[PDB]
C-alpha cells in the first residue's frame, strides 16, 4: 500500500466512526458503520497471506450480517413511529434486533467466535484498531438506545461475555488471541453497567482502550506475537518487561492501579440499584482474567526464560519502532487511581 493510500483509508475508518457518533438519523448511523466496514478490510488484508484472507472474510461476513439486522431494526422502528431520530426505539422487536446487531459488531458472547480468530489472523497494528477504535461506534449507539434495551438480554450478554472471555483466555498461548478473549471479557463489564449508569460504561471504555493500546504498542515494539517470543524481552529491553508487568497487573484490576477504577465504580453503581449477586459474580469471574494475565507476567518479567545465541546480535541495535504515545499511555494505564473523581468530566 502506498503511504498516501494508507492514510486516506485510515481517515475513512475514523470518518465512518465519527459519522456514527454525530448522526441524529438512523440512516446516517448505518452509513457510518458501512463506511467503517469498507475501509477496515484493506487494513486486514494489508499483508496478503491466507490467514489474513481468512480473517478478513470472517470479519466481513459477521459485520455485514450485523448491518442487515441493524437496518432491519431501523425499518421496523420507522414503521411503528414514522421517524428516524437516533434515540430509544419504539418497538421491542426492533430493540432486540438492534441490540443483537450491536453485540455482533462488538463481538460479545455468544456472538464472540470471530474475535479470537480475526485478531489472530491480522497484524498487531490492525488488531490494535480492531480491539479499540472499532468498539467506539457500537458503544456510542448503545449509549443512546439503552432506555429501550431489554434488561434481561443485555445482562445475559454481559454475563456470558465475562465467563467466555475469562475461560477462553486460559487456553491461549498466542498474544493476539489472549488480547481478543480479554476484550470479550471487558466488553461484558461495559454493557453490564449500561442499564444502570451509562457514564460508567464510558469510563470503562476509555480506560480499557488506554490499557489495550499500551499492550499492543509494547508487543509491536518487540514484534512479539507469542508467549515464548515475548519471554525473550528480558534479554533485550528490561524496561519493557516492567512496563508490561505493570500494565498486566492494571488490566487485572488490582489496586492501586488504574484498571481497578472501572471495576470499582461499576460495582458501586450496581450495588446502588440493589444489584448484589451480579457484581459479586462478575468480580469473582474476572479472576480468570487475572490468572492468565499473571501467567504472562511470570514468563515475561518475574522469571528469566531461556534465550538463544543469536539474541546477542540484537543487543547491538536500538529500538527503532515509533512507539507513539507509549510513555503517556503506560503512565495513564497504571497511575490514574488517585484521580478517580475525574470521572465526572464524562457526565
Amino acid at each position: 500500500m502506498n503511504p498516501i493510500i494508507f492514510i486516506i483509508i485510515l481517515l475513512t475508518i475514523m470518518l465512518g466512526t465519527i459519522i456514527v457518533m454525530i448522526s441524529s438519523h438512523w440512516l446516517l448511523v448505518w452509513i457510518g458503520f458501512e463506511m467503517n466496514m469498507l475501509a477496515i478490510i484493506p487494513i486486514m488484508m494489508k499483508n496478503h497471506n491466507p490467514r489474513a484472507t481468512e480473517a478478513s472474510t470472517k470479519y466481513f461476513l459477521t459485520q455485514s450480517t450485523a448491518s442487515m439486522l441493524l437496518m432491519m431494526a431501523v425499518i421496523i422502528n420507522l414503521m411503528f413511529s414514522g421517524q428516524w431520530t437516533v434515540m430509544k426505539l419504539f418497538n421491542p422487536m426492533a430493540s432486540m434486533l438492534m441490540t443483537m446487531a450491536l453485540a455482533m459488531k462488538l463481538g460479545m458472547a455468544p456472538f464472540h467466535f470471530w474475535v479470537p480468530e480475526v485478531t489472530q489472523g491480522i497484524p498487531l497494528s490492525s488488531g490494535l484498531i480492531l480491539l479499540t477504535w472499532q468498539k467506539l461506534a457500537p458503544m456510542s449507539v448503545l449509549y443512546q438506545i439503552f432506555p429501550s434495551i431489554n434488561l434481561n438480554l443485555i445482562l445475559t450478554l454481559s454475563v456470558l461475555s465475562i465467563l467466555i472471555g475469562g475461560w477462553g483466555g486460559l487456553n491461549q498461548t498466542q498474544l493476539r488471541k489472549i488480547m481478543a478473549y480479554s476484550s470479550i471479557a471487558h466488553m461484558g463489564w461495559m454493557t453490564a453497567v449500561l442499564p444502570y449508569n451509562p457514564t460508567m460504561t464510558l469510563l470503562n471504555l476509555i480506560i480499557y482502550i488506554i490499557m489495550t493500546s499500551t499492550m499492543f504498542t509494547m508487543f509491536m515494539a518487540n514484534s512479539t506475537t507469542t508467549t515464548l517470543s515475548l519471554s525473550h524481552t528480558w534479554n533485550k529491553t528490561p524496561i519493557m518487561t516492567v512496563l508490561i508487568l505493570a500494565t498486566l497487573l492494571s488490566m487485572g484490576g488490582l489496586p492501586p492501579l488504574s484498571g481497578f477504577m472501572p471495576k470499582w465504580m461499576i460495582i458501586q453503581e450496581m450495588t446502588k440499584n440493589n444489584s448484589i449477586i451480579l457484581p459479586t459474580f462478575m468480580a469473582i469471574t474476572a479472576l480468570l482474567n487475572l490468572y492468565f494475565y499473571m501467567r504472562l507476567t511470570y514468563s515475561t518479567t518475574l522469571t528469566m526464560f531461556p534465550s538463544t545465541n543469536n539474541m546477542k546480535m540484537k543487543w547491538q541495535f536500538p529500538l527503532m519502532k515509533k512507539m507513539t504515545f507509549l510513555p503517556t499511555m503506560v503512565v495513564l494505564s497504571t497511575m490514574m487511581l488517585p484521580l478517580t473523581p475525574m470521572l465526572s468530566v464524562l457526565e
Binding site: 486516506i8 483509508i9 475501509a39
Partner: peptide, 14 residues
Amino acid sequence: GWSLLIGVVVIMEI
C-alpha cells in the same frame, strides 16, 4: 460519493 470512491480504492488493494 466518498464511499463509492473509497470502494474503488479498496477493491484494488484487496
